[PDB]
């Protein structure tokens, strides 16, 4: 059944923690584990990082941690590095169900010369490689937590939640879905529909697929799961199979759900939002609806939740 979690006093706060730790005095957390999430055919490594904050930096699902990688700011000598934000991929109880760890889902930013393909480690992303290079016992400077856009609306435990992720944008939704389905949270018994759409390059690039597939078998009446494998599938128009093409495959169901009050979440590449808007406008147009008016109503009704980068 659902996994026992502790401490239940993490449910007591009425407001999300915010900026508990700030950049000039971060919390020195400790790495528990780092593991690759992806297989050899993935275009790049995405790693899962479990971070022991000891209960000192609690958060709510949908929030981000800040990480200050070591070193000095290049554009400000003697200054610390800037914060990088990472959507937390764990529930508030974390992957050890004890309120002491949080997890990040981090893609290594690797530079390749556009013409030679030559790598240049000096142009690699500092924090993402710092994180995926981390080992148990290493220290991580944490700030935050931060973010309210992606907090899970729990007022209606039978709400519908349509989650659209690309790549590491899956992070908040791993947290949502563990709280909805995996953890024994007496004060949040989810009985609605959670529908995850996940776009990744190929099968080897899938993130937490075994976990999400397990929800299909455990909660078949409350969870749906669709993947867009961009380098293994192509869309109706011939472009690579992207999440927007998967949304289009279910557009009548999705619009009906939205009309019924469903929340819809977008997390991942900022570049996916224009193609999603184009798809939704085309879908609306075929239904004889104005997408612009629909989106205005969704935003007014606080059904529309976007965090992309
Ligand atoms: C709210 C929020 C949540 C986020 N959640 C996540 C998440 O869950 N997972 C995740 O992986 N990311 C997430 N991101 C992105 C993350 O914050 C970082 O921006 C990302 O990890 C890259 O930071 P970095 O320190 O590795 O790269 P930086 O060192 O900041 O470099 C940025 C980019 O510039 C490139 N670059 C550096 N120098 C050069 C050069 N000389 N020429 C050309 N290119 C260069 C790097 O290769 C890299 O791609 C999130 C962003 C936001 C705003
Ligand atoms: N809270 C946040 O804001 C937050 C949280 C987590 C992640 N992020 C951001 O999310 C991004 C995730 O990048 P990643 O490296 O994990 O993913 P990625 O591998 O670059 O892309 C993931 C999938 O999205 C596809 N894709 C590319 N362009 C697209 C488009 N216009 N529309 C739809 N799909 C498209 C890719 O296909 P192809 O590569 O085959 O084209 C791939 O299949 C990062 O930029 C990160 O900063 C933001
Ligand atoms: Mg895999």
TrEMBL record:
Catalytic function, reaction form: 2 reduced [2Fe-2S]-[ferredoxin] + NADP(+) + H(+) = 2 oxidized [2Fe-2S]-[ferredoxin] + NADPH
Binding residues for NADP(+): 87, 107, 168, 230-231, 240, 268-269, 307
PROSITE patterns for this protein: FAD_FR
Family: Belongs to the ferredoxin--NADP reductase type 1 family.
Domain FAD-binding FR-type: 24-152
Domain of life the protein comes from: Eukaryota
Keywords: Chloroplast, Electron transport, FAD, Flavoprotein, NADP, Nucleotide-binding, Oxidoreductase, Photosynthesis, Plastid, Transit peptide, Transport
Gene Ontology annotations of biological process type: electron transport chain; photosynthesis
Disulfide bond entries: 47-132
Gene3D superfamilies, A to Z: Nucleotide-binding domain of ferredoxin-NADP reductase (FNR) module (3.40.50.80), Translation factors (2.40.30.10)
Pathway: Energy metabolism; photosynthesis
Gene Ontology CC annotations of this record: chloroplast thylakoid membrane protein complex
InterPro entries noted in UniProt: FAD-bd_FR_type, Flavoprot_Pyr_Nucl_cyt_Rdtase, FNR, FNR_nucleotide-bd, FNR_plant_Cyanobacteria, OxRdtase_FAD/NAD-bd, Riboflavin_synthase-like_b-brl
First-level EC class: oxidoreductase
Annotated EC: 1.18.1.2
Entry protein name: ferredoxin--NADP(+) reductase
Gene Ontology MF, one: electron transfer activity
Positions bound to FAD: 84-87, 105, 107, 123, 126-128
PANTHER family: PTHR43314
Cofactor(s) needed by this chain: FAD
Subcellular location(s) per record: Plastid, Chloroplast
């Amino acid at each position: 059944s659902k996994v026992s979690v502790a401490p239940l006093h993490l449910e007591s706060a009425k407001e999300p923690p915010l900026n508990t730790y700030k950049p000039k005095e971060p919390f020195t957390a400790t790495i528990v584990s780092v593991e690759s999430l992806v297989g050899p055919k993935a275009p790049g490594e995405t790693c899962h990082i479990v971070i022991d904050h000891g209960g000192n930096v609690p958060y709510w699902e949908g929030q981000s941690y800040g990480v200050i990688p070591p070193g000095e700011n290049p554009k400000k000598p003697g200054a610390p590095q800037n914060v990088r934000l990472y959507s937390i991929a764990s529930t508030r109880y974390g992957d050890n169900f004890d309120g002491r760890t949080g997890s990040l889902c981090v893609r290594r930013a690797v530079y390749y010369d556009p013409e030679t393909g030559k790598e240049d480690p000096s142009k690699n992303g500092v924090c993402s490689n710092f994180l995926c290079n981390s080992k148990p016992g290493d220290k991580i400077q944490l700030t935050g937590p931060s973010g309210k856009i992606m907090l899970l609306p729990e007022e209606d435990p039978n709400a519908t939640h349509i989650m659209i992720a690309t790549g590491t944008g899956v992070a908040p939704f791993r947290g949502y879905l563990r709280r909805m389905f995996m953890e024994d949270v007496p004060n949040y018994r989810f009985g609605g529909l959670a529908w995850l759409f996940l776009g990744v390059a190929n099968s080897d690039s899938l993130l937490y697929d075994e976990e999400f597939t397990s929800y299909l078998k455990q909660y078949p009446d409350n969870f749906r799961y669709d993947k867009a494998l961009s380098r293994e599938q192509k869309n109706r128009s011939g472009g690579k199979m992207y999440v927007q093409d998967k949304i289009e495959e279910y557009s009548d169901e999705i619009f009906k759900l939205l009309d019924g009050g469903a929340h819809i979440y977008f997390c991942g590449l900022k570049g996916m939002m224009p193609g999603i808007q184009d798809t939704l406008k085309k879908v609306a147009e075929r239904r004889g609806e104005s997408w612009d008016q629909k989106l205005a109503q969704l935003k007014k009704n606080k059904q529309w939740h976007v965090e992309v980068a």
